[PDB]
């Protein structure tokens, strides 16, 4: 009914440490895997951290805000899901004593761990080292990390260019002191949405800039390509327009019958000529196109395009600048079809296309993939978006942090300097932070078999008297320098995993009472 | 860390249970192994009582809980897909290896460097398995060599009795569907069919096809020598009138003629037919006529063609019609109006079995038939069941052996020498690591599971035989010589597999040692159970 006192302090932390406490093994490449009990016959042996997270029936509902907390992380990165959820478990593990034991106001917490959330954003930046993110040969060995490990390693090369190829198509770089800095924007969501092709070659999957339309063209011989196109978008089907209201004819004179006819004929001329006013190369229309207006406009010199969805033509109108018209009296000599490159018509896969690609960059593409089956293409799908994801965090930010355990310690380190200097009752939960982070480095130990507790000080040493760069290595276990082999990762993938881990975290701790009502 | 209705094994617990339901489906199916293996009876819960030996209907037939033994049955029913052999001995090798695993489990050992020594250990095991095969000679004169592979298919799963009875069957059943060259081999032309009313050792071979409709009426002749085939898809039975009416007689003789006029059409038809045999060896010794006719076929015809010795079969089954027209020859007769002479096929002597109950009516010596038929017989349901996973395995199993030109010697012969290999090869090589000794010396040790059951089915003492053999291997290899050894089941100690003709499929070990070695790391990698939703 009523959690008062510090008993809700209790459970929020609870349900943050079982969640966090499920996934510990699930961290890292050598992470062992989860056997899952369903209440039927079935058994789920997937080591995917949102996978079993998922699977799991939860009570207490901070284990359901720790849930859509890994939903936050799967939108923004593509990996490190579990890092996040057991950063954020552990900050609130290692504040349970010092919020009850030693009896510290939650404010008092909750405003020392954004003094630490600033200070280790600042460690991150400072442990970080750029990389060149125009080196095509440095940007495939970055998302390598994100490739290996699955079916794509053997064209792992050309899962790069279609990754790097697709975002710097829709990547507007800008900055001045004049009209501001985007800071790099890319939208891998809305304009990099991809068409997936059954059949062919990786090698013959290319980055279309454009949209891609599955239609094909209405006659065969007509135009294949168009120098300076017009482009006229438009919903309403093509024929004979019939009245709204209540239209009979009624034809008693002989001669009158055939004229009618006629005029009928010259209605869907009509409706075809208000749109060859603009003159215009291409007609895309929502609905199908009737074969007398197959032949005016065949014989008016534009191409035809039938049977085109809605949602389709909504992202035409963005990279060409056509608006749809409905009635063909109606239509505007403002919008315009500039910058489209080819109406290429070309069969792939014995299934004619329609290409709309272009020679210009309109903040949008359609990435065009083959592959040996549909199930190849989820596959290719799925990584593509994690190859970008990873490209995304390289063009988002010049450099690259260390991995395994060695950024994790490098913050510790840092925040242990910075607690001896900083004076008040904040300082003692501002140790906290500093053991939470060294949970993600000795739980990479316990996942590896070797001593939690010998590794981890000796892991320290390295990172007090030598440098930051040496981390754990996940085949061996032992404690190496992460310059050698590297498993550097980019730091935006660090920057909101410690930014949202103390939101998470902070907001679980305001909550003092649990009621339940509507 | 709890919430209501939730059940969580957590800090080892889960690898106490999970190594435990590993021996528990071991123990049970330890029981039946090679040819000294045992019975045993699977309740459908419909009253129907099913003897088999055969892990692969064991595993479907019962239900368990535990979630390890269904991740081995899963995993064992991809190894009948592939395999289809063999399903106990891959149980017996993930149960020993996870038994072996959870004695260092509790010195302390980390579960991955546990299932690092069984990775590096099964590569190190594809290595010796190229080497320890055996090249056999693609020929297919070596039938001796097939009744090799036949007895190991055989004498598994039956009295042994049984196999001098199914080896003639099984083997002439392979080399007969496939043709000599190097192109394939086709399971399905070869048809299983069960009969009752007689003893299961009296079970034979079919060159030709076995069906169950045949000639009824008295004087039809059961024994035809050398005949002409004849595939008609017409109706020579009675047919009546598209739409209604009704035949109306003034006479009652007229009643007949009325009845004869509507049978006229299709007499007309019976006319043609009979004229055929007429006209091509009507007197003719050792040739003859016979109607295979699909649909219905009325006593008055029976009765004709009786009369002229033709047999003539109705009601046969859309299948058999167009696998007769593929053995026989004879082109399948929409309309009698089109017969001739030189659609009609050429069949071998067709002489009808007959019971009390039923008739059978043979195919057999065809000139092409490209079809086979093994027909299983027995007096009760247990020897049906028992004789058909023994034709079904025993079929797959000679059809490996000429897909895949690679042999492997039986009797324990891969396994006690791999086992020896890893054992002589880790200590001289010492390039794994030294906390991966325990996960390649548990791994050698957990593969003696094999050899060690194997004999433990028989009664003898399994501590003696494997001293003999490895004594055994340890003087073949002082004598700088290669010697194949194995364990003889009957005697006790050791043999040759080669020249007891004990052969096990190198496609069959090799799924064998990669499947559980891949089965029993997956379930060493659980630290934790979790039970929520429930």
Same mark, same amino acid.
Do not use: D
């Given at each position: 009914e009523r959690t008062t006192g510090r008993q809700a302090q209790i459970s929020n932390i609870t349900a943050a440490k079982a969640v966090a406490d499920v996934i510990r093994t699930c961290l890292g490449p050598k992470a062992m895997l989860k056997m899952l009990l369903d209440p039927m016959g079935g058994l789920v042996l997937t080591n995917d951290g949102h996978a079993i997270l998922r699977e799991i029936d939860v009570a207490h509902p901070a284990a359901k805000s720790m849930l859509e907390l890994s939903r936050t992380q799967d939108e923004e990165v593509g990996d490190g899901t579990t890092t996040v959820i057991i950063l954020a478990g552990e900050i609130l593990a290692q504040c349970a004593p010092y919020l009850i034991e030693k009896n510290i106001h939650p404010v008092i917490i909750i405003q020392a761990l954004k003094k630490a959330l600033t200070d280790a954003l600042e460690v991150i930046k400072q442990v970080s080292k750029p990389v060149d993110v125009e080196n095509d040969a440095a940007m495939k060995k970055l998302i390598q990390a994100s490739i290996?490990? %699955?079916?794509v390693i053997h064209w792992s090369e050309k899962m790069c260019e279609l990754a790097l190829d697709a975002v710097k198509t829709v990547r507007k770089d800008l900055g001045q002191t004049? &009209?501001? &800095? !985007? $800071?790099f924007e890319i939208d891998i969501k809305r304009y990099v949405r991809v068409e997936k092709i059954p059949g062919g070659d990786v090698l013959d999957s290319r980055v279309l800039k454009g949209v891609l339309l599955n239609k094909d063209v209405?006659? !065969? %011989?007509?135009?294949?390509?168009?120098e300076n196109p017009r482009v006229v978008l438009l919903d309403c089907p093509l024929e004979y327009k019939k009245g709204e209201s209540q239209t009979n004819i009624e034809i008693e004179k002989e001669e009158d019958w055939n004229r009618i006819l006629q005029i009928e004929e010259e209605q869907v001329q009509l409706m075809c000529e208000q749109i060859l006013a603009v003159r215009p190369t291409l007609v895309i229309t929502e609905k199908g196109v009737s074969d007398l207006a197959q032949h005016y406009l065949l014989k008016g010199g534009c191409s035809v395009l039938r049977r085109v969805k809605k949602s389709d033509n909504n992202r035409i109108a963005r990279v060409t600048g056509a608006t749809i018209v409905n009635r063909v009296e109606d239509l505007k000599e403002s919008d315009v079809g500039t910058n489209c490159g080819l109406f290429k018509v070309e069969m792939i896969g014995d299934e004619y296309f329609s290409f709309l690609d272009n020679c210009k960059e309109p903040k949008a593409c359609t990435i065009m993939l083959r592959g040996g089956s549909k199930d190849i293409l989820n596959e290719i799908d799925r990584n593509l978006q994690d190859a970008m994801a990873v490209a995304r965090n390289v063009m988002l930010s010049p450099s690259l942090s260390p991995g395994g355990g060695a950024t994790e310690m490098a913050v510790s380190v840092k925040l242990a300097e910075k607690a001896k200097q900083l004076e008040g009752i904040q300082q003692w939960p501002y140790q906290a932070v500093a053991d939470a982070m060294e949970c993600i480095p000795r739980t990479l130990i316990q996942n590896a078999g070797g001593d939690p507790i010998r590794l981890l000080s000796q892991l320290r040493a390295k990172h007090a008297?030598? $440098?930051?760069?040496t981390g754990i290595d996940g085949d061996k276990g032992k404690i190496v320098d992460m310059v050698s082999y590297g498993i550097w990762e980019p730091e935006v993938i660090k920057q909101q995993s410690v930014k949202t881990a103390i939101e998470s975290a902070c907001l679980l701790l305001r909550v003092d009472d649990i009621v339940s009502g509507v | 860390l709890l919430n209501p209705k939730a059940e969580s094994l957590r800090r080892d617990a889960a690898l106490k249970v999970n190594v435990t339901s590993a021996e528990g489906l071991q123990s049970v199916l330890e029981t039946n192994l090679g040819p000294k293996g045992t019975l045993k009876m699977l309740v459908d819960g419909a009253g129907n009582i099913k003897l088999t030996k055969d892990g692969k209907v064991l595993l479907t037939e019962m239900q368990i809980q535990s979630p390890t033994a269904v991740l081995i049955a899963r995993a064992a029913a991809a190894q009948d897909e592939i395999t289809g052999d063999g399903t106990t001995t891959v149980v017996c090798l993930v149960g020993e290896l996870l038994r072996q695993a959870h004695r260092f489990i509790q010195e302390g050992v980390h579960p991955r460097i546990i299932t690092d020594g069984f990775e590096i250990a099964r590569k190190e095991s594809m290595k010796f398995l190229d080497e320890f095969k055996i090249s056999k000679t693609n020929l297919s004169n070596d039938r001796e060599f097939l009744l090799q592979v036949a007895r190991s298919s055989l004498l598994t799963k039956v009295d042994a009795d049984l196999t001098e009875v199914l080896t003639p069957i099984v083997t002439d059943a392979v080399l007969s569907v496939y043709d000599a060259q190097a192109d394939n081999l086709d399971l399905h032309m070869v048809e299983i069919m069960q009969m009752q009313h007689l003893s299961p050792k009296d079970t034979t071979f079919i060159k030709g096809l076995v069906l169950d409709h045949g000639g009824r009426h008295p004087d039809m002749p059961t024994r035809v020598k050398n005949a002409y085939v004849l595939i008609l898809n017409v109706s020579l039975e009675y047919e009546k009138t598209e739409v209604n009416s009704g035949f109306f007689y003034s006479s009652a003789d007229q009643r007949d003629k009325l009845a004869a006029s509507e049978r006229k059409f299709v007499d007309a038809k019976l006319k043609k037919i009979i004229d055929l045999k007429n006209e091509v060896c009507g007197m003719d010794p050792d040739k003859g006529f016979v109607i295979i006719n699909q649909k219905g076929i009325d006593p008055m015809s029976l009765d004709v063609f009786a009369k002229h010795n033709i047999l003539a079969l109705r009601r046969a089954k859309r299948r058999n019609m167009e696998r007769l027209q593929l053995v026989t020859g004879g082109e399948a007769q929409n309309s009698v109006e089109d017969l001739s002479p030189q659609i009609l096929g050429f069949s071998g002597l067709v002489y009808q079995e007959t019971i009390g109950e039923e008739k059978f009516t043979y195919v057999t010596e065809n000139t092409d038939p490209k079809s086979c038929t093994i027909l299983i017989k027995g007096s009760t349901h247990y020897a049906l069941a028992q004789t058909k996973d023994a034709v079904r395995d025993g079929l797959r199993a000679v059809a490996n052996v000429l897909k895949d030109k690679n042999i492997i010697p039986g009797a324990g012969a891969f396994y006690i020498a791999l086992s020896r290999y890893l054992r002589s090869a880790n200590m001289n090589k010492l390039g794994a690591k030294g906390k991966t000794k325990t996960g390649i010396e548990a791994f050698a040790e957990a593969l003696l599971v094999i050899p060690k059951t194997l004999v433990k089915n028989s009664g003898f003492d399994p501590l003696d035989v494997l001293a003999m053999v490895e004594d055994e291997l340890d003087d073949a290899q002082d004598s700088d010589e290669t010697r194949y050894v194995g364990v003889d089941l009957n005697i006790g100690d050791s043999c040759d597999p080669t020249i007891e003709g004990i052969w096990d499929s190198y496609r069959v070990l090799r799924n064998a040692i990669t499947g559980a070695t891949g089965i029993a790391s997956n379930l060493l990698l659980c630290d934790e159970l979790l039970r929520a939703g429930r």
């Open positions: 290996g490990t %699955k079916y004049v &009209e501001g &800095e !985007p $800071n209405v006659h !065969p %011989k007509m135009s294949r390509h168009i008297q030598g $440098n930051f760069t | -």
